[PDB]
């Protein structure tokens, strides 16, 4: 129908000039196929292959969490080891990866003869309670780190006596506790320990000997860069928290200089960022700077360490009669029975779990962003110059979403004034970037904005995100 | 001068199993996990979805026998709804539904074949398109050569898909056999409830995606040797086994990977492969890619046949029914299909068309099932095989309607845009299907073009 019949077509399509045409077309198609294959293989070969992952351990993937006073964490009258197992959900809300419990051994005073690191103080709990806590944490994938300090209720933390016996007993305690299943250890105030470097090296060697998934934390109170670097002259896998970033912060350039000098001197290794070893953020900063530092500590190439109550801006001096070394957590308006009515609904965890304009919500968002992207996990860090009082830096791993942080430590507004031509072309910032979040309410999110006319409000931080260039 | 049966029941079972198993459970198990309830609840959802699909099968198992004509979902509604709706269906079908399907499957094949050369870094975009086009062209050439080879190719690739799924099941069971709690006891931890917008319901229109393709065998009917018993037997063999395979695969994934790990991943199959097998893990991705290969073949083996149906009625140009006299393969239809797929390759992103894919196919199925009972009422005396009652389909029909609801939830504007294509296709019908009155010049040109094409590629008409 509407075409040549079968017999006529088979009679007419046998002459030369039509079989040759079909053969030529077949040859052309089949050669074009091989040409496309060759093009595909050339495209595949001519491309950078990839960058291999650095095989991170468990403590590279998130922020730690310290607890200096177990009894005061959930209020008086309920301080016990088994009490913690009812709180991990809240901790699981913060998506932390560690839990640095306070010292729970038997130590009444500077007495040494009968101060043991192997017996749990009955005031806290029992060995079975500790085992249950560890099992529940393992089910929740929250690693537990146990503190060890011969004196935590006295004045001097090392008995002010010959350190051989305490070194031997803590060495025995390390191997005794590693059987139970602890995932690390922490020692504080090591600056008061004679011949610290040899002891730290031996302890690190012993701890790494049991497994490759164990951690050792060392804490000092000094802030001298040379002093900090001295303790690392024989150890490179130690995490040393110290008051290096404290006693300053008034000018943005000073903090930038401190961070850059520390990274240059340490040789770009894994370090831990914290404003102190056993104190909260409010003990060194005004109430208007917590958001700025909380944004700062989540985007540094390291493992942030926070003390308990630093996600709701707890203040020791805001409530009279509360010791500054152990503030009471504010779970509700009744969390402080003494002088009731002195706590508002804004300082309570339950009062901040639903308000996006609060520290806790920002804390949760930052923690979620830190433990998810590869650039914030093992990305490369590059800081470039900007205007005075500013701190701007970039994180970029290989080919993933690049992050750009801009911070205004100054008290007055100013322009951005960012400078290019000092980063590799693979890390050059684009003209327009998105805005993942801002610590100052009054701005929109998800809107790609230009970087040429960017202005910063006093004490404001920006977390722009842009894709591969 | 007409194509022969050259299909047995085993080939039909292989075709349906292969076309059901596409990317499916290999790429998107995370959805139901993070869209409704808890891990354990997800184990229920898939099963429920399977029952749904099974019910739908038991409709086409009878309707297909009712009107023994090729071109499923087109010739069946050709009778009830008249001429214009059938042509509209066929036109939008060929224009969007097929090329999207072939291109998506081919692109998935290319990506999961090229993955072992770019484990963490993303695969280059240029290479994937070229590999997909090469696969499509090679499969078109193979189908055009002889259907007999394509039958064994489809059989072998369906067997390979089943073997890969069985290996996945075996590894998932062995990683439990060593002794571990594997967090299976905690269930319904964050189940919540069905929200006002819909929480448990929200997972069904994503779970049903892997269960699609249960009517491709009805496209190439009347090419089967004694379809009367073979087609229902093929359906009954195919559906329960694939449903149980999917639910067991979901169990295997849940027993080896935590919720957080699954949420923080894109390709669950790659994680499962490199987790419990380590070196030489390339077996897991490559097989997946190989699977997609067979899938593409199946699509072609249906698509061209549908076109061969259309020109029989007159809705299509007379050339798109031509047959090579010595090789039965319908060459012009295959060339048309591959050309359409390659033209569809020129896009700007993925998933831009799949959004209304469910809307289109579900509305077509719903209209077909509605027409079934009206046809039965208007003609209650027929030689149908089971004389089954309309008890089962009616409920199914209502469920179909529910889908349109969700369809007009996410992108109603995209649906409105999609309607414009069929609205512009109405003039396509009016141009040549009905307005037979044409000037002599146009008829002469059409005849000259047709005879030129027949001279170029040796094809003789069908009788
Ligand atoms: C561990 O400390 C010692 C002190 O010299 C050194 O290695 C010791 O001796 C051999 C050689 O490595 C090891 O098999 C022992 O296990 C080490 N003794 C320990 C644990 O102190 C070296 O300084 C360090 N090397 C290791 C193994 O970490
Ligand atoms: C760290 O804390 C100690 C105690 O407050 C500071 O003072 C030292 O105290 C010990 C006694 O425990 C003395 O033996 C030292 O001589 C004191 N140090 C100095 C420099 O005199 C110590 O100064 C603190 N560290 C820093 C860097 O301030
Ligand atoms: C780390 O910074 C130091 C300190 O600037 C640099 O080492 C040399 O330091 C002296 C004194 O400042 C100067 O000669 C230069 O600043 C440095 N020498 C060079 C680089 O020519 C150095 O830039 C950085 N790298 C290290 C680890 O030395
Ligand atoms: C939570 O809300 C109460 C009620 O306003 C705050 O109490 C105010 O404290 C601010 C400084 O924080 C003072 O300027 C006001 O005089 C107080 N107003 C009243 C009516 O009490 C409470 O301080 C708020 N929380 C914080 C720390 O800002
Ligand atoms: N079911 C195919 C993909 C697919 C095939 C056919 C369909 O009709 C459909 O909607 C979707 C798969 O498992 O990957």
Residue numbers in the entry:
A (entry chain A): 162 to 630
B (entry chain B): 44 to 506
What does the primary publication say about this deposited structure?
Among the various amino acid transporters, the L-type amino acid transporter 1 (LAT1, SLC7A5), in complex with the heavy chain 4F2hc (CD98hc, SLC3A2), facilitates the transmembrane (TM) transport of neutral amino acids with midsized to large, less polar substrates, including L-leucine (Leu), L-isoleucine, L-valine, L-phenylalanine, L-tyrosine (Tyr), L-tryptophan (Trp), L-histidine, and L-methionine, in a sodium- and pH-independent manner. LAT1 serves as the light chain, which is directly responsible for substrate transport, whereas 4F2hc acts as the heavy chain, ensuring proper localization of the complex on the plasma membrane and modulating transport activity. Like other solute carrier (SLC) transporters, LAT1–4F2hc operates via an alternating-access mechanism, cycling through distinct conformational states to facilitate substrate transport across the membrane.
To explore the substrate recognition and transport mechanism of LAT1–4F2hc complex, we determined the cryo-EM structures of the complex bound to various substrates: L-Tyr, L-Trp, L-Leu, and L-DOPA, at resolutions of 3.20 Å, 3.58 Å, 3.10 Å, and 3.56 Å, respectively. Specifically, the HAT + Tyr, HAT + Trp, and HAT + DOPA complexes adopt outward-facing occluded conformations, with Phe252 partially occluding the substrates. In the HAT + DOPA complex, the carboxyl oxygen atoms of L-DOPA are hydrogen bonded with the backbone amide groups of Gly65, Ser66, and Gly67, whereas the substrate’s amino group is stabilized by the backbone carbonyl group of Ile63 and Gly255. Interesting, the para hydroxyl group of L-DOPA can form hydrogen bonds with the α-amino group of Gly256 and away from Tyr259 compared with the Tyr-bound complex. Although the side chain of L-DOPA remains unclear at the current resolution, its orientation was modeled based on the available electron density and further supported by known interaction patterns observed in related structures. In the L-DOPA and Diiodo-L-Tyrosine-bound structures, Phe400 is oriented toward the binding pocket. The distance between the hydroxyl group of Tyr259 and the hydroxyl group of the substrate also underwent noticeable changes, with distances of 2.6 Å, 2.9 Å, 3.1 Å, and 4.2 Å for Tyr, Diiodo-L-Tyrosine, Trp, and L-DOPA, respectively. Interestingly, although Tyr259 does not directly interact with the L-DOPA or Leu substrates, its mutation may affect transport by perturbing local interaction networks or altering the conformational dynamics of the transporter during the substrate translocation cycle.
